[PDB]
Amino acid sequence: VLSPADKTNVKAAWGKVGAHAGEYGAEALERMFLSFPTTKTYFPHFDLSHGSAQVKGHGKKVADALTNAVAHVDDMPNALSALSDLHAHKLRVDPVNFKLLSHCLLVTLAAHLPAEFTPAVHASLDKFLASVSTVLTSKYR
Amino acid sequence: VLSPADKTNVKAAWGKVGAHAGEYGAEALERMFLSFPTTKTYFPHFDLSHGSAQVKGHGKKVADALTNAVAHVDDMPNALSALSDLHAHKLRVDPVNFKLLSHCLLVTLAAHLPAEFTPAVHASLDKFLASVSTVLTSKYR
Amino acid sequence: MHLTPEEKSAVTALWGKVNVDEVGGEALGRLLVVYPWTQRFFESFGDLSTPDAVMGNPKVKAHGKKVLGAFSDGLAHLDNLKGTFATLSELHCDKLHVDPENFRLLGNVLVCVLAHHFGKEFTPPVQAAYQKVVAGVANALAHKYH
Amino acid sequence: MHLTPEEKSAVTALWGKVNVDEVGGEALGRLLVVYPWTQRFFESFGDLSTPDAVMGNPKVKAHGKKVLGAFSDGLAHLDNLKGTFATLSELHCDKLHVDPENFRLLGNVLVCVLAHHFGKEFTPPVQAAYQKVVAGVANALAHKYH
Ligand code: HEM
Ligand code: HEM
Ligand code: HEM
Ligand code: HEM
């Protein structure tokens, strides 16, 4: 569970992302494709080339969803219900892949928010992504 | 989330275990030690030799807790508060290990409850061990 | 593999007693039931709406036999799983888009099926050797992913 | 360890810029803070009660430097990690009783640390090289477990 502290940390770090969320979403994806090539099996239909608009398009969607979970930090299960359904029923992404993306998101943020990416914030962001992942996977079986 | 069918399935299966739960606890540990030797890092103080009373005793302890969990299948979090504590603040077993014991437990039940280890029951027990695992690692951070 | 001659013989000897037909169908079906998300690759098989519909589905049973078949032949090249599954590794990556994690889920299901079938015979030491093979197989199959 | 020449040059070029003293302290400190369960091995280090207590603990800093020291040496023998890390693998198993999963957590934290420090210089492709490296090292450190 996220503590008040965690919540503050997350709102703060995400606060800084602002308008770059989209780009940071795309970058996390590329990092993921490059470091964990097995994740590519889910995007057979995508152009995964560098600067792919499909990837850009997708990074934005992921970022919007994260931004929405931050906005509803006290009601994530409900704020993400729809996305939880999609993943469980249509996409059916194996759960292990959530940890991979989370990881690449943390790398991206670290790479862009040096002043904010403190140990405390890092820990908060990690617990947060873990919670998002848990929500998105809750209806799998 | 355990469905009512699941809860039924579990209670049934565990019902058949009966006076053998202790033996099955002990057998599941032994299978864990041999198949995933990295798990032994948490029991340096034990005699991990076949038929060790330390292993037998511990097997009982674990079996008992599962029992209590089946019994409070509706209120696990509460039934296992103490245990969640112990693990999070004292034992501090890495979360990956819970999946290994869970697997050795299925294998043990399968090998002992042939008639009862149907596909639907297998699915339920798995979910159950998963839930138990979540509960035991919920206060980790 | 990093199998001990003793571990090799245990594997080998239990396998001799296996009905691939039955174990193959059961392993794949259990997979589709325990980890429902694996059904994403078998939409064309039909109705997998229930344990019963999965376990009874002939397409499932026949795919199961094909998979254990290939697995079975891999047990004859236990000292080069890599080379035995190379073409199958490419296929799975490049044509099927199967996440290698699936290989690991099946492996574990396989072990549960063997225990199920052999009861007593499937001892801790025998499970240990089988755990090494399933891991070995999964690794070999995932080897050509890029 | 499938490091292409270009992946190896990339690991090496960046490693040139690292202050192991510093990175070592940050990586270890951050591990103890993000995954507090890992604090189980350091009850003799004193106060690890808060982020500042951990990050500034003279004992954590000194240990981090030791750990990264061994890691850097590993980077000069990318060819023979298993060999390089064998006595350490044995020590961690037999004397320290450190669950190898710990080696993977530290690798991920280290990757975040390098990202933190190099910013834009830690490109997608550089991360992918380092990902292969931390995995190879974790694997080498676990090779002697039994
Ligand atoms: C916290 C992590 C994640 C978030 C917030 C997220 C969110 C989303 C969103 C917002 C969409 C678009 C749905 C729409 O069309 O409106 C989506 C689609 C998708 N996601 Fe997830 N997702 C996450 C994890 C993953 C992972 C780990 C994978 C696989 C490696 C994955 C695979 C997919 C796929 C294949 C699609 C469909 C894309 C398309 O065809 O356009 N997702 N996700
Ligand atoms: C299925 C989930 C598990 C359950 C229900 C469980 C239950 C228990 C119980 C009932 C105890 C004894 C408490 C006491 O002494 O009063 C215990 C202790 C312990 N558990 Fe957990 N456990 C689980 C998973 C694990 C795993 C996966 C590991 C490590 C691989 C582990 C490591 C330990 C250790 C090291 C002890 C203390 C042993 C001793 O010093 O006597 N547990 N657990
Ligand atoms: C023990 C590991 C496995 C082995 C040895 C194996 C082997 C095979 C073989 C021999 C084929 C025949 C295809 C051909 O030659 O054209 C095949 C096809 C296929 N496999 Fe795998 N497989 C394994 C695991 C899996 C898993 C776990 C899944 C998904 C859950 C999977 C999904 C498929 C699919 C979707 C096909 C295509 C069947 C069709 O054309 O309808 N495989 N596999
Ligand atoms: C890159 C991975 C690692 C390397 C290269 C490494 C290296 C070392 C070295 C060189 C030593 C000193 C050896 C000696 O005392 O003779 C050491 C000790 C130790 N390591 Fe590791 N280590 C690694 C990861 C870890 C992790 C992740 C943990 C725990 C989470 C850990 C726990 C310990 C402990 C508890 C000691 C003994 C400290 C003491 O003197 O009390 N190590 N390690």
From Swiss-Prot, chains A, B:
Impact upon substituting residue 91 to P: In Port Phillip; unstable
Annotated positions of the Phosphoserine modification: 3, 35, 49, 102, 124, 131, 138
Tissues expressed in: Red blood cells.
CDD domains associated with the record: Hb-alpha-like
Glycosylation sites: 7, 16, 40, 61
GO biological process assignments: carbon dioxide transport; cellular oxidant detoxification; hydrogen peroxide catabolic process; inflammatory response; nitric oxide transport; oxygen transport; response to hydrogen peroxide
Name of the protein: Hemoglobin subunit alpha
Swiss-Prot record, chains C, D:
Tissue expr: Red blood cells.
Annotated positions binding (2R)-2,3-bisphosphoglycerate: 1-2, 82, 143
Outcome recorded upon mutating residue 101 to K: In British Columbia; O(2) affinity up
Phenotype upon changing residue 75 to R: In Pasadena; O(2) affinity up; unstable
Listed result of changing residue 63 to Y: In M-Saskatoon; O(2) affinity up
Outcome of swapping residue 111 to A: In Stanmore; O(2) affinity down; unstable
Modified residues (N-pyruvate 2-iminyl-valine): 1
Consequence of substituting residue 132 to N: In Yamagata; O(2) affinity down
Effect of residue 143 to R: In Abruzzo; O(2) affinity up
Reported effect, residue 66 to T: In Chico; O(2) affinity down
Effect of residue 23 to F: In Palmerston North; O(2) affinity up; unstable
Result after altering residue 145 to H: In Bethesda; O(2) affinity up
Known outcome of mutating residue 146 to P: In York; O(2) affinity up
Outcome reported for the amino acid change (mutating residue 96 to V): In Regina; O(2) affinity up
Positions carrying N-acetylvaline: 1
Outcome of mutating residue 5 to R: In Warwickshire
Positions annotated to bind heme b: 63, 92
Further facts: One molecule of 2,3-bisphosphoglycerate can bind to two beta chains per hemoglobin tetramer.
Known role: Involved in oxygen transport from the lung to the various peripheral tissues.
Protein name (record): Hemoglobin subunit beta
Origin species: Homo sapiens (Human)
Lineage summary: Eukaryota, Metazoa, Chordata, Craniata, Vertebrata
